[PDB]
Design a binder for this molecule. Structure first.
Ligand SMILES: [Cl-]
Ligand SMILES: [Cl-]
Ligand SMILES: [Cl-]
Ligand SMILES: [K+]
Ligand SMILES: [Mg+2]
Ligand SMILES: [Mg+2]
Ligand SMILES: [Mg+2]
Ligand SMILES: [Mg+2]
Ligand SMILES: [Mg+2]
Ligand SMILES: [Mg+2]
Ligand SMILES: [Mg+2]
Ligand SMILES: [Mg+2]
Ligand SMILES: [Mg+2]
Ligand SMILES: [Mg+2]
Ligand SMILES: [Mg+2]
Ligand SMILES: [Mg+2]
Ligand SMILES: [Mg+2]
Ligand SMILES: [Mg+2]
Ligand SMILES: [Mg+2]
Ligand SMILES: [Mg+2]
Ligand SMILES: [Mg+2]
Ligand SMILES: [Mg+2]
Ligand SMILES: [Mg+2]
Ligand SMILES: [Mg+2]
Ligand SMILES: [Mg+2]
Ligand SMILES: [Mg+2]
Ligand SMILES: [Mg+2]
Ligand SMILES: [Mg+2]
Ligand SMILES: [Mg+2]
Ligand SMILES: [Mg+2]
Ligand SMILES: [Mg+2]
Ligand SMILES: [Mg+2]
Ligand SMILES: [Mg+2]
Ligand SMILES: [Mg+2]
Ligand SMILES: [Mg+2]
Ligand SMILES: [Mg+2]
Ligand SMILES: [Mg+2]
Ligand SMILES: [Mg+2]
Ligand SMILES: [Mg+2]
Ligand SMILES: [Mg+2]
Ligand SMILES: [Mg+2]
Ligand SMILES: [Mg+2]
Ligand SMILES: [Mg+2]
Ligand SMILES: [Mg+2]
Ligand SMILES: [Mg+2]
Ligand SMILES: [Mg+2]
Ligand SMILES: [Mg+2]
Ligand SMILES: [Mg+2]
Ligand SMILES: [Mg+2]
Ligand SMILES: [Mg+2]
Ligand SMILES: [Mg+2]
Ligand code: NA
Ligand code: NA
Ligand code: NA
Ligand code: NA
Ligand code: NA
Ligand code: NA
Ligand code: NA
Ligand code: NA
Ligand code: NA
Ligand code: NA
Ligand code: NA
Ligand code: NA
Ligand code: NA
Ligand code: NA
Ligand code: NA
Ligand code: NA
Ligand code: NA
Ligand code: NA
Ligand code: NA
Ligand code: NA
Ligand code: NA
Lengths: 237, 56, 73
RNA sequence: GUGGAAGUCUGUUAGAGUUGGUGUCCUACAAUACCCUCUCGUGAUCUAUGUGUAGGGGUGAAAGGCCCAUCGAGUCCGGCA
RNA sequence: GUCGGGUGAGAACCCCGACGGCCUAAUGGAUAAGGGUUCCUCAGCACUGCUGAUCAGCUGAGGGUUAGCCGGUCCUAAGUCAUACCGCAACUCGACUAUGACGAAAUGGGAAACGGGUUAAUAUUCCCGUGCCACUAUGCAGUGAAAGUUGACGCCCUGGGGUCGAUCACGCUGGGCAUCGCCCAGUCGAACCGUCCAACUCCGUGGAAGCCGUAAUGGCAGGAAGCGGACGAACGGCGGCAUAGGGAAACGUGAUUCAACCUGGGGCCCAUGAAAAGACGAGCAUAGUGUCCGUACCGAGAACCGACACAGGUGUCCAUGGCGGCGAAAGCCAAGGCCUGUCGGGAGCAACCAACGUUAGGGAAUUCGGCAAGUUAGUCCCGUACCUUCGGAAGAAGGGAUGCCUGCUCCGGAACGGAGCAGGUCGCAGUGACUCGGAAGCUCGGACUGUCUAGUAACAACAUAGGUGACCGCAAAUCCGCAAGGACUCGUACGGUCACUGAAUCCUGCCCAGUGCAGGUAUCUGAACACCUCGUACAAGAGGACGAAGGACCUGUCAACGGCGGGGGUCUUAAGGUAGCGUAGUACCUUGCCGCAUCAGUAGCGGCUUGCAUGAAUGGAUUAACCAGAGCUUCACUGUCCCAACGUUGGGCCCGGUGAACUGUACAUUCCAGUGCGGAGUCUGGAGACACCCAGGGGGAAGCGAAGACCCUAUGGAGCUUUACUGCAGGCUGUCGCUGAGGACUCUCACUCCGGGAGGAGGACACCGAUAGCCGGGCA
RNA sequence: CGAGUGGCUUGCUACCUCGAUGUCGGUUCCCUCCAUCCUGCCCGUGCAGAAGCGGGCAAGGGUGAGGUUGUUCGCCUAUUA
RNA sequence: ACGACCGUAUAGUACGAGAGGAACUACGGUUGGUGGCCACUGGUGUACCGGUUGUUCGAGAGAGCACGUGCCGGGUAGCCA
């Protein structure tokens, strides 16, 4: 047979790539020598094409102009601060250690300085639970408890644009326009709707997968489709 | 639309042109590579052994 | 509201569209001033036609249940 | 009343598409054409130019469709008498 | 096209004139690509031209393309290349990271040109006139100069400013017509320099507690109107340019609607609508410089692609010429172009055929089927069912009106805009042509728009929103690469990958035995290295101990593959079909039975239903709206039919010119029989038969076309599949090397990642190299 | 029970064609067979008549229109000698 | 190149309890087929004449185009049924 669609993806061709050249900025936390003195003002709120959410334009004291992952509640004129001594208000960035337990946070760094990795999508937020001199326990939106270096910087508040998922696309057309702003091939043809040659589920006089749909983790690419290493399926029980 | 005659009409593109290096009209002006002498890809000239019977 | 959709898409789909958009288009009370002149500028972007304040809010609402939990904590 | 939304309606505007006639043609005007009929026609729209993906590989809203009249594995030459 | 005429040895088709036509988003005008001299002139007809040719895009020779201000050039886009680095056995191969370069001629950004004249052929290029830009030099001014602005931006609606055009009024110039008095053309004049400024923004004054304002939204004591002012637009107005230019002449004035151009307001996004060069910011005089490449022509029913002077294909701009009308529609007509969608002559011109008109009475009787054709039709008024997701259904259906002429009314600033009134009046017919829906009902399917088999399938197939399950905390899941590396990702669970189902509505039962996936696991099984025993002065080899993933075993899981019976009042194998639906697009028996409907209905619909062999996200039922989707009924309509006729146009037939192809073992005027490898013009017997030619519709030559697609055979091929055979990638796992200090543990020094660095995390693991076991149609 | 005739059906066979003899139904148009449905002339009758029933000669002529089904067949209607 | 049917008189007769109900013969008509013909009816009749919409030739008059008649009304001959 032929490579299945998952295998074409890997190749990173035009069809599969994301319109990078159309993206605005790689939202990352600033780098501060130390002191925390670093502060800046919100100059404007712009739409981020890569995340379908708002992004804040900020002018820092030392002349630096950069876009920032804006939490809900940030407006023009506001003053944001970044550093160990930053005040504890929404929009400000400071290590998990300096953050008070029980406070919602977003755009968390996995390892100090990486610039933030966790909780950055629409309306999500992490939950700083436990402190320590060694470990900072944070609950990520997936519900997982993430043990982190209390040095990892994070932003106070919840990511802007919450509720996006509450409204249905309603029509293909609307998915279409969104999909075009992402690195994804759309629409999706069902395997079972293809020919044997094209997908392990293809073929037959009627549509139905050939074998069961749960596949082993060890399955090779080309065969790994359907329910991947599923721990269970269905709703019952 | 027929892939034949009716699809012959749109062929007003220029591709293979006179090669500055070997003089054949095989310099692909989009690729800037000659399909005949390899000019634009190889310093050495294009040549393969299958261009002639194995024993000759 | 949903009336633009004619008899297409079904009940649930459009009903949630009107709902979401009626809340979406309500008069909203500005954070800086106190006037009810906040209007959605774009996806998650809000502004006060009065004082010109541009705020980061929910996608279809200026305040999200969660945005509010922040203030307290 | 105002407003003027809509993968909204009529529509041979342009343009795109191709349902029936199983008409005409079928050593053709044409190696896929002509006519009447018919569909879409502000949108997942149509289009020019540039540009990317290459052969067990692409590309595929999936028909094994398409990748220069070539496709259930292009074309050329060689293996090859 | 026709009649005259011109040229010529020769004229239906080369040229002039008239008459008659054709093209109106093109058959006109300007061009991109592509072509490449096809452009102009002269000379020709052996080639080419669907006939002819004195013609030509043909043959031959000459000639023709003139730019500071049009393009290129320059900038940067998706992206491309080179060099370096690294990989690879290696390269002309290969990803990343650096640097550099390349990447837009209509149609991205962009310093600057207008008017007239001229040639056989060029022309914002030459000439005449006038203007403009950049750089440099000189001089005066200026010391400001880099912040900022601009370049520079989406989709929908909309206001204002406003030129051309078109039209209206009136005057002038010229023309046309000749029952009136109308009808047509013209009435000109740039770049540029100067000047004016609506909109937006802002300032002062003012001081609204209800006013201000809009087409609409809106505005305001955080200061409304009004008043005054700062900034501030057109390819626009105005003046110059201009006793420039152009016109035979006059060489106008106002108006309305207003493309271009300018300037605003509103709305939309799970969509956010380039960048860089450059310009401005930042004066003036004079002078010098402004090189290089493109420039002809076609741009198409003969200059392009399609073997052709091919009925095909092929991008941009002119979308404002008149009447008409909603209209960039029809139809008619200008300007401009053409008679080259290039063979002609003749016969009332038969049969037959292609397109087409009309047909009395009947009216789907035709047919698989109303296929084909027809009916309806524009606008206004009345009026409008079931059903429904309240949006829709709906132009439902049905009923009425519709011209012209006279005089008016209303809305509006007004239109050569719209709505009405009264009277008069003609026709068979007033949307009088043209344009222009036939309607209604039942059933099936897919919800909808959308997609598809370029070239027999447009559908019920795919997609889709919506539903659902799965994997993953990012040094991730998934995927590409041999490697160096890479997509997703300028992304971070409201994410994204992988799958199933397919809007809404009511719902989605029971089964984990098999198979799959996952988790656990006392015990059992489980490879190699190292370790022990035997063996061998070593070794091969035999055995033991230890035991990973995996398996046994146990559990979880069906919106995971799938299953939901026989028997009796349990058995196979886990369960034993629930809600629904049902003779189904699933029902063999089958035209099932009953009903509706018809004269008659293997159809259709409804009910029944034991369902050969329905049934719940292999989704079930059901469903408004939508449909070139499948079946059925009714009204309307009609040459579909009864049953054909007549007519129109092009052919067909005759004549001039041009001039193929298919096909051909031979013989051949056959017919009836017989015979023969059982399907004979040719054998045998008879019959018939004078030769040639024209037209016809095609009975036969098992007619021509294609080494049969069906079927079988071949120790043929290929694509595809799997618990076929053998192997190969890939994943998991143990072991060795990198690898270091003190059956569980600490550390740091390699190595890895994070951090700009300091340093932080991890750490002898991981990565990588080698090997072993398991899984392994992903692949061979 | 026994003897046959036909060559419409079916089956059997594998003789003919696999370098192709275009498979159903229908339609249109032509010729034929008789084992005669009607019509002509007859015989018998359980032949009163009328209407039939059976049989003989006989192929001149006729043998039609429709509803379901692609259907052939057939089922059904109304006409009909 | 003619095939067949219906009707009337025969006859409410023969026959028959009755109900019912013939024929020979002579007539009139229908149907299917056949050959011909066109006074009559009907169709056609882009010969012709009129009406009238749009547009163009200034109006008028008179015309062209609207597919090979713009549409509508009438229709001679001939050809037809
Ligand atoms: Cl999405
Ligand atoms: Cl140019
Ligand atoms: Cl406005
Ligand atoms: K055969
Ligand atoms: Mg990033
Ligand atoms: Mg979703
Ligand atoms: Mg929407
Ligand atoms: Mg994309
Ligand atoms: Mg799909
Ligand atoms: Mg398929
Ligand atoms: Mg497969
Ligand atoms: Mg299915
Ligand atoms: Mg092809
Ligand atoms: Mg539409
Ligand atoms: Mg339409
Ligand atoms: Mg392209
Ligand atoms: Mg298939
Ligand atoms: Mg010439
Ligand atoms: Mg000449
Ligand atoms: Mg360049
Ligand atoms: Mg340009
Ligand atoms: Mg010229
Ligand atoms: Mg030119
Ligand atoms: Mg020609
Ligand atoms: Mg009739
Ligand atoms: Mg019928
Ligand atoms: Mg019939
Ligand atoms: Mg039709
Ligand atoms: Mg008034
Ligand atoms: Mg009409
Ligand atoms: Mg059915
Ligand atoms: Mg559909
Ligand atoms: Mg097709
Ligand atoms: Mg279709
Ligand atoms: Mg089709
Ligand atoms: Mg879905
Ligand atoms: Mg989903
Ligand atoms: Mg589907
Ligand atoms: Mg039924
Ligand atoms: Mg279920
Ligand atoms: Mg399925
Ligand atoms: Mg003989
Ligand atoms: Mg063969
Ligand atoms: Mg086969
Ligand atoms: Mg094989
Ligand atoms: Mg790194
Ligand atoms: Mg295989
Ligand atoms: Mg034959
Ligand atoms: Mg006999
Ligand atoms: Mg006979
Ligand atoms: Mg005419
Ligand atoms: Na399948
Ligand atoms: Na309203
Ligand atoms: Na068509
Ligand atoms: Na290949
Ligand atoms: Na070969
Ligand atoms: Na000619
Ligand atoms: Na001016
Ligand atoms: Na007009
Ligand atoms: Na549509
Ligand atoms: Na099971
Ligand atoms: Na199981
Ligand atoms: Na089932
Ligand atoms: Na459609
Ligand atoms: Na007809
Ligand atoms: Na013949
Ligand atoms: Na194959
Ligand atoms: Na016999
Ligand atoms: Na043969
Ligand atoms: Na047949
Ligand atoms: Na007979
Ligand atoms: Na029948």
């Amino acid at each position: 047979g032929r490579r299945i669609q998952g295998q074409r993806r890997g190749r990173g061709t035009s069809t599969f790539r994301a319109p990078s050249h159309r993206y605005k900025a790689d939202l990352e936390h600033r780098k501060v020598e130390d002191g925390d003195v670093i502060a800046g003002t919100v100059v404007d709120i712009e739409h981020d094409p890569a995340r379908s959410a708002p992004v804040a334009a900020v002018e820092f004291e030392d002349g630096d102009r950069r876009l920032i992952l804006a939490p809900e509640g940030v407006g023009v004129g506001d003053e944001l601060q970044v550093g160990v001594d930053a005040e504890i208000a929404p929009g400000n960035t400071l290590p998990l250690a300096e953050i008070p337990e029980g406070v919602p946070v977003c755009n968390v760094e996995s390892s100090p300085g990486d610039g933030g990795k966790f909780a950055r999508a629409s309306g999500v937020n992490a939950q700083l639970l436990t402190h320590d001199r060694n470990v900072a326990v944070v609950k990520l939106p997936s519900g997982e408890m993430k043990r982190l270096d209390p040095q990892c910087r994070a932003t106070i508040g919840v990511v802007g644009g919450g509720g996006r998922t509450d409204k249905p696309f309603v029509k293909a057309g609307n998915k279409h326009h969104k999909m075009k702003a992402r690195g994804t091939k759309w629409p999706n043809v069902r395997g079972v709707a293809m020919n044997a040659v094209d997908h392990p589920f293809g073929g037959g006089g009627r549509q139905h997968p050939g074998k069961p749909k749960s596949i082993s983790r060890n399955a090779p690419p080309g065969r790994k489709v359907g329910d991947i290493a599923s721990k269970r399926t269905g709703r019952g029980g | 639309t027929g892939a034949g005659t009716p699809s012959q009409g749109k062929k007003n593109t220029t591709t293979h042109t006179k090669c500055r290096r070997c003089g054949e009209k095989s310099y692909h002006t989009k690729k800037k590579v000659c399909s005949s002498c390899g000019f634009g890809k190889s310093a050495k000239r294009r040549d393969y052994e299958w261009q002639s019977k194995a024993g000759e | 509201r949903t009336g633009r959709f004619g008899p297409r898409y079904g009940l649930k789909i459009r009903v949630r569209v009107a709902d979401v958009e009626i809340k979406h288009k309500k008069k909203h009370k500005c954070p800086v001033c106190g006037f009810k002149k906040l209007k959605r500028a774009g996806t998650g972007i809000w502004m006060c036609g009065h004082c010109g304040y541009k705020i980061a809010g929910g996608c279809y609402q200026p305040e999200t249940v969660a945005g509010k939990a922040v203030m307290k904590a």
